[PDB]
Design a protein around this ligand. Sequence first.
Ligand code: MG
Ligand code: MG
Ligand code: MG
Ligand code: MG
Ligand code: MG
Ligand code: MG
Ligand code: MG
Ligand code: MG
Ligand code: MG
Ligand code: MG
Ligand code: MG
Ligand code: MG
Ligand code: MG
Ligand code: MG
Ligand code: MG
Ligand code: MG
Ligand code: MG
Ligand code: MG
Ligand code: MG
Ligand code: MG
Ligand code: MG
Ligand code: MG
Ligand code: MG
Ligand code: MG
Ligand code: MG
Ligand code: MG
Ligand code: MG
Ligand code: MG
Ligand code: MG
Ligand code: MG
Ligand code: MG
Ligand code: MG
Ligand code: MG
Ligand code: MG
Ligand code: MG
Ligand code: MG
Ligand code: MG
Ligand code: MG
Ligand code: MG
Ligand code: MG
Ligand code: MG
Ligand code: MG
Ligand code: MG
Ligand code: MG
Ligand code: MG
Ligand code: MG
Ligand code: MG
Ligand code: MG
Ligand code: MG
Ligand code: MG
Ligand code: MG
Ligand code: MG
Ligand code: MG
Ligand code: MG
Ligand code: MG
Ligand code: MG
Ligand code: MG
Ligand code: MG
Ligand code: MG
Ligand code: MG
Ligand code: MG
Ligand code: MG
Ligand code: MG
Ligand code: MG
Ligand code: MG
Ligand code: MG
Ligand code: MG
Ligand code: MG
Ligand code: MG
Ligand code: MG
Ligand code: MG
Ligand code: MG
Ligand code: MG
Ligand code: MG
Ligand code: MG
Ligand code: MG
Ligand code: MG
Ligand code: MG
Ligand code: MG
Ligand code: MG
Ligand code: MG
Ligand code: MG
Ligand code: MG
Ligand code: MG
Ligand code: MG
Ligand code: MG
Ligand code: MG
Ligand code: MG
Ligand code: MG
Ligand code: MG
Ligand code: MG
Ligand code: MG
Ligand code: MG
Ligand code: MG
Ligand code: MG
Ligand code: MG
Lengths: 136, 205, 118, 122, 59
Amino acid sequence: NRGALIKLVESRYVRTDLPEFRPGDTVRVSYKVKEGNRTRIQDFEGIVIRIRRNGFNTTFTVRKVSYGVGVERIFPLHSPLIQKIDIVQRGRARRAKLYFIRNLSDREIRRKLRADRKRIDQDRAAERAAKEEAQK
Amino acid sequence: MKGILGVKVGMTRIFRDDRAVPVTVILAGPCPVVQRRTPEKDGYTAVQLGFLPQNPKRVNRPLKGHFAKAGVEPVRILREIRDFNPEGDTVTVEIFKPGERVDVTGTSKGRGFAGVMKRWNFAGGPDSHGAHKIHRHPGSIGNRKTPGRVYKGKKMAGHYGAERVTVMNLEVVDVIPEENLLLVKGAVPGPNGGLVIVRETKKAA
Amino acid sequence: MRHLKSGRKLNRHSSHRLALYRNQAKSLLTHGRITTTVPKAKELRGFVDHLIHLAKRGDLHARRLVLRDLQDVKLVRKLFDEIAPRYRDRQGGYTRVLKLAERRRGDGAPLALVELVE
Amino acid sequence: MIQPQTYLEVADNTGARKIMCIRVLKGSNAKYATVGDVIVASVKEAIPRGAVKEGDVVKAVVVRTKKEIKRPDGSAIRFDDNAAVIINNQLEPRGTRVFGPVARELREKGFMKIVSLAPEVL
Amino acid sequence: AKHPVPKKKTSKARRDARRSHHALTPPTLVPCPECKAMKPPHTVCPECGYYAGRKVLEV
RNA sequence: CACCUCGAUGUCGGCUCGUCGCAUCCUGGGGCUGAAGAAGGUCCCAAGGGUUGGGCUGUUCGCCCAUUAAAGCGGCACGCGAGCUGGGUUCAGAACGUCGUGAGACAGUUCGGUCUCUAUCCGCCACGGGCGCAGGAGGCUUGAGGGGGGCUCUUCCUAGUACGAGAGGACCGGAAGGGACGCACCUCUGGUUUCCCAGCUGUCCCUCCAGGGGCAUAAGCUGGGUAGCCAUGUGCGGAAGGGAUAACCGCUGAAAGCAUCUAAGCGGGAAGCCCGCCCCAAGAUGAGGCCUCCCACGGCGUCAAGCCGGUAAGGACCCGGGAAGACCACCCGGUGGAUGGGCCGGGGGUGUAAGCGCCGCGAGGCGUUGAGCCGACCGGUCCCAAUCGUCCGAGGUCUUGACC
RNA sequence: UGCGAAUGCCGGCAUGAGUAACGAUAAAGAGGGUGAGAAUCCCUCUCGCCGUAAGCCCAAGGGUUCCUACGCAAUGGUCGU
RNA sequence: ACCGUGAGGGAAAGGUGAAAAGAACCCCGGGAGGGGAGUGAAAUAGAGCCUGAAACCGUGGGCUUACAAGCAGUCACGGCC
Ligand SMILES: [Mg+2]
Ligand SMILES: [Mg+2]
Ligand SMILES: [Mg+2]
Ligand SMILES: [Mg+2]
Ligand SMILES: [Mg+2]
Ligand SMILES: [Mg+2]
Ligand SMILES: [Mg+2]
Ligand SMILES: [Mg+2]
Ligand SMILES: [Mg+2]
Ligand SMILES: [Mg+2]
Ligand SMILES: [Mg+2]
Ligand SMILES: [Mg+2]
Ligand SMILES: [Mg+2]
Ligand SMILES: [Mg+2]
Ligand SMILES: [Mg+2]
Ligand SMILES: [Mg+2]
Ligand SMILES: [Mg+2]
Ligand SMILES: [Mg+2]
Ligand SMILES: [Mg+2]
Ligand SMILES: [Mg+2]
Ligand SMILES: [Mg+2]
Ligand SMILES: [Mg+2]
Ligand SMILES: [Mg+2]
Ligand SMILES: [Mg+2]
Ligand SMILES: [Mg+2]
Ligand SMILES: [Mg+2]
Ligand SMILES: [Mg+2]
Ligand SMILES: [Mg+2]
Ligand SMILES: [Mg+2]
Ligand SMILES: [Mg+2]
Ligand SMILES: [Mg+2]
Ligand SMILES: [Mg+2]
Ligand SMILES: [Mg+2]
Ligand SMILES: [Mg+2]
Ligand SMILES: [Mg+2]
Ligand SMILES: [Mg+2]
Ligand SMILES: [Mg+2]
Ligand SMILES: [Mg+2]
Ligand SMILES: [Mg+2]
Ligand SMILES: [Mg+2]
Ligand SMILES: [Mg+2]
Ligand SMILES: [Mg+2]
Ligand SMILES: [Mg+2]
Ligand SMILES: [Mg+2]
Ligand SMILES: [Mg+2]
Ligand SMILES: [Mg+2]
Ligand SMILES: [Mg+2]
Ligand SMILES: [Mg+2]
Ligand SMILES: [Mg+2]
Ligand SMILES: [Mg+2]
Ligand SMILES: [Mg+2]
Ligand SMILES: [Mg+2]
Ligand SMILES: [Mg+2]
Ligand SMILES: [Mg+2]
Ligand SMILES: [Mg+2]
Ligand SMILES: [Mg+2]
Ligand SMILES: [Mg+2]
Ligand SMILES: [Mg+2]
Ligand SMILES: [Mg+2]
Ligand SMILES: [Mg+2]
Ligand SMILES: [Mg+2]
Ligand SMILES: [Mg+2]
Ligand SMILES: [Mg+2]
Ligand SMILES: [Mg+2]
Ligand SMILES: [Mg+2]
Ligand SMILES: [Mg+2]
Ligand SMILES: [Mg+2]
Ligand SMILES: [Mg+2]
Ligand SMILES: [Mg+2]
Ligand SMILES: [Mg+2]
Ligand SMILES: [Mg+2]
Ligand SMILES: [Mg+2]
Ligand SMILES: [Mg+2]
Ligand SMILES: [Mg+2]
Ligand SMILES: [Mg+2]
Ligand SMILES: [Mg+2]
Ligand SMILES: [Mg+2]
Ligand SMILES: [Mg+2]
Ligand SMILES: [Mg+2]
Ligand SMILES: [Mg+2]
Ligand SMILES: [Mg+2]
Ligand SMILES: [Mg+2]
Ligand SMILES: [Mg+2]
Ligand SMILES: [Mg+2]
Ligand SMILES: [Mg+2]
Ligand SMILES: [Mg+2]
Ligand SMILES: [Mg+2]
Ligand SMILES: [Mg+2]
Ligand SMILES: [Mg+2]
Ligand SMILES: [Mg+2]
Ligand SMILES: [Mg+2]
Ligand SMILES: [Mg+2]
Ligand SMILES: [Mg+2]
Ligand SMILES: [Mg+2]
Ligand SMILES: [Mg+2]
Ligand SMILES: [Mg+2]
């Protein structure tokens, strides 16, 4: 027995070091790349378009426009190749997956996605709190 | 030719060396050898194995406390590892080290009565133009007066799946003696929870 | 193949399969014991065990939820005030299903019994 | 995944705008071209006086695909269009200056001029 | 499709051998826990079915 | 030619599905070359596997585009219409050219024009029932014999070496990537997910409001979507190796003092053959073997086999079920029990319920609240149901040879 | 005046076979009643379908099908009270 | 009768017994049917009634058949009844 508990044992690859976010709010993920036997940390930053929750190997995809072409990247949420991920802004999604933005991509999405104050306000307030409460 | 019984647990991915490595973890528990075969009494060479210790006694009367290590007699004994003559009793997953290649026998998910096209990846009929109720159908099966019959291997629809299947040369990614786990990449046959037997490869041996 | 798939279609499309389970619930809760065919029965259990359990919750929300399927206000009172309490210390299994030895004559159907437990 | 009949955006300045795949050059029978694959194309829409004319049969390499590219590191990328760069038979760009992102798979397939000329490589 | 038709009237031998599986099985019955009569198992008896739960009353 | 078929053997082409032949298109092995190398030419061996996608035409064929290792040729009623098509041909309508005074007519053209749910036998794919396998049982397995499979390219190192004035450019040996095909799998990617959540319109309704139900498809529409089934997704396969051979290359060697691979011998030598791999497999009536069980009752048959009744090991039946499945089978349970259902925990999906408070004239907005709802996935728990039972099942044929 | 054949004629009975099918995919569930017997009849409740109709009225045509009592052999594509 | 708008077409279908003596009454059964009883020279003359053939269906018995393959017979030997 413990069919899932065994496969759930299987991960020493879970990682707690990355931030909370949901679809709709924009983030920036730094990712190890090769680029000809050298090594670089490339950043990729756009709206997170969706999140697939499987526990370990959940994955989340990020969309942005780059030099006049939309791009989506799909990252494994536990990937050993993610150095860090910063949330660069929060936004109010209204539904789980937003693919609908692909056929907007214009000003109409900054109207559809207006920033989520509740989670913004609780970020600052969480950052003031942890800042004040570490030192003294 | 080392081998051990197990059950397919489930799949996941492992991130080894900045690569994904999808893996199928099969649990191969301790395996209490209950018989040996000899060119003397038998005419070939193997071990009976035995697995999944359960039943209190459903075992009833024919049994072996003859080798007596059948203490806590196991549900499935599935046996031959063929030419395998191990160290002592009780083969473990210690048997395999990572980077070892292995073949895996198992029982393919049963599809029951399955069309040609999914049995045999036939083409089927067009979905339009003439059409008329042959979209999923096999076509001609033969010629005319000669031979005036149907070849003895002729691919047709019937029960497909739920059969013996051995996918070969799989890489052992990891082995976890602690919980008796083992990690191979990919193809291994059949449902989670089904029995699999796991042998050294035939690429070299 | 339709492997590890839960729940029966019983020779009727979805909306009729709903109406079936609802109309069996209203009837069972009403008479306390009912005779259907064995498979329609085995499949009624879950439908009402949940309907009952939500009455054990008692909250207005939980009522309104039961009111979606059972739809009749008076029955819901009888569910909430009369029936629900009897199970308060019963965790699960608020229904019994017992097979009858008589085959329905003229379609041949196996019959069973469905009653609220006690 | 590109196949014959597929239209492609032209990601360089040669003067082609749209090309349409006519063959994918991989094997005898390869079914689809992807990022880093060379195809043969007919030039469908082209800007006046270009290096390249409408109707020319040419070779292109595929720098972008609407169908996601999967990487070993477990991740994927996908772009908003399918795009190609028109190339000569020695297989280097016919243009100066490519436009928009290119897939990093190109480097690995040996196209170092185009990845270089590319504004962003993802 | 054209009209497949049987080519030969089948022998009495042959239909009767077709039917070699057609024979019935008697219903499987067990003696009633309380009452005298026979009942197919796992079924509430046509007379006084069970104990703990409330049987259909022939009582 | 006119032999079976005119009380009917459906006719081109396509499609589907192939199977065979080899006079071999490619790949493998070879000899000769007017074979420097690379690349060809020609002929020999070889049928294992492979043998592309388009434009045009009803086309076969052919021509052409773009590729390729190659874009083989034949046969199987010009394979295959109780498998499909119906563009062509090949009824009836209509027109053109042409022929005919005409009615009409044309391997001349044009547009149109009914392709028949139900498989008895053989054959083929699957799956069971019976009996047999001379004592009966529960396991486990040998493999006679079958089947599957069998392709190939680029690049790189060797080495810009050998060879060549140069340009070009090997053998052999090694490495890494592909294509297409196969088997499996669902972690990822990507689909479906008929009621898992949400939103929306019209109407009717419960109960006026709030909230909600029906219907708008066999989901009203829309946005998503677990398991499962899936390919676009992933893993793995072709081998290695062993043997015998083909053409061929040789050794030794006469007949024939020489010579000769051959007449006696022997060694090399193919993607082919036999093994090797994978799958089936003792109805292999030639019914195999191993482990373990139960036992050698009672009567009649005083006897060649038996018979009847309980029995024994064991099975069935019935029931709860199952990534097993058309039914049957197979597998797991059956209270000394976690088998299904319910409940609970988790996963997962939807995306912050209802109620209430506050802001706004209002539509609405905020908070409570990642809320509420929540199939299947991983578990837990005897609350509901797998209760109680019933039936069947050996007591072992003889001859013959070796043991206390 | 003699039958084995005439795709003979008339009748009977087989085979195919317990096979196809049981005639619109608007749809059913339960409780009670009746009766020798009930999925199929009666009554309640719930669910679904029609609503420029699948409701109502008239003309053709049909000719007792009308209402009621008693009744189930057959007719009813099953059953039938 | 039926079929055809019509002219018109156009069938099947005989037999208890000498005599109804046409089976009271009891039993099973809702009836149908049957078992007894009774009638009769006779009731497999019982009204679906003289005789009652054959194909066809069935029950019981004997011989036989699950490693044989065929126009089904025939010739021979052997077994069992
Ligand atoms: Mg667990
Ligand atoms: Mg299945
Ligand atoms: Mg297949
Ligand atoms: Mg298709
Ligand atoms: Mg169709
Ligand atoms: Mg034919
Ligand atoms: Mg033949
Ligand atoms: Mg199922
Ligand atoms: Mg049905
Ligand atoms: Mg509906
Ligand atoms: Mg290059
Ligand atoms: Mg048809
Ligand atoms: Mg058919
Ligand atoms: Mg002739
Ligand atoms: Mg003549
Ligand atoms: Mg003819
Ligand atoms: Mg004929
Ligand atoms: Mg004919
Ligand atoms: Mg040849
Ligand atoms: Mg060659
Ligand atoms: Mg050369
Ligand atoms: Mg040559
Ligand atoms: Mg060949
Ligand atoms: Mg065109
Ligand atoms: Mg055409
Ligand atoms: Mg031509
Ligand atoms: Mg071609
Ligand atoms: Mg051919
Ligand atoms: Mg010909
Ligand atoms: Mg032909
Ligand atoms: Mg046809
Ligand atoms: Mg035919
Ligand atoms: Mg035509
Ligand atoms: Mg005619
Ligand atoms: Mg004229
Ligand atoms: Mg003509
Ligand atoms: Mg003509
Ligand atoms: Mg027309
Ligand atoms: Mg037509
Ligand atoms: Mg035949
Ligand atoms: Mg059998
Ligand atoms: Mg063999
Ligand atoms: Mg073989
Ligand atoms: Mg070099
Ligand atoms: Mg999954
Ligand atoms: Mg998926
Ligand atoms: Mg899913
Ligand atoms: Mg009201
Ligand atoms: Mg309202
Ligand atoms: Mg309504
Ligand atoms: Mg509404
Ligand atoms: Mg309506
Ligand atoms: Mg509807
Ligand atoms: Mg989707
Ligand atoms: Mg030789
Ligand atoms: Mg010599
Ligand atoms: Mg000599
Ligand atoms: Mg010789
Ligand atoms: Mg040799
Ligand atoms: Mg090979
Ligand atoms: Mg086997
Ligand atoms: Mg055997
Ligand atoms: Mg045996
Ligand atoms: Mg089942
Ligand atoms: Mg069992
Ligand atoms: Mg349970
Ligand atoms: Mg969640
Ligand atoms: Mg809110
Ligand atoms: Mg106010
Ligand atoms: Mg939950
Ligand atoms: Mg417990
Ligand atoms: Mg019949
Ligand atoms: Mg049939
Ligand atoms: Mg059928
Ligand atoms: Mg049917
Ligand atoms: Mg009907
Ligand atoms: Mg109907
Ligand atoms: Mg209206
Ligand atoms: Mg009138
Ligand atoms: Mg009339
Ligand atoms: Mg009348
Ligand atoms: Mg009336
Ligand atoms: Mg009446
Ligand atoms: Mg009647
Ligand atoms: Mg009737
Ligand atoms: Mg008349
Ligand atoms: Mg008398
Ligand atoms: Mg009598
Ligand atoms: Mg007589
Ligand atoms: Mg008489
Ligand atoms: Mg007389
Ligand atoms: Mg008579
Ligand atoms: Mg008989
Ligand atoms: Mg034999
Ligand atoms: Mg025999
Ligand atoms: Mg035969």
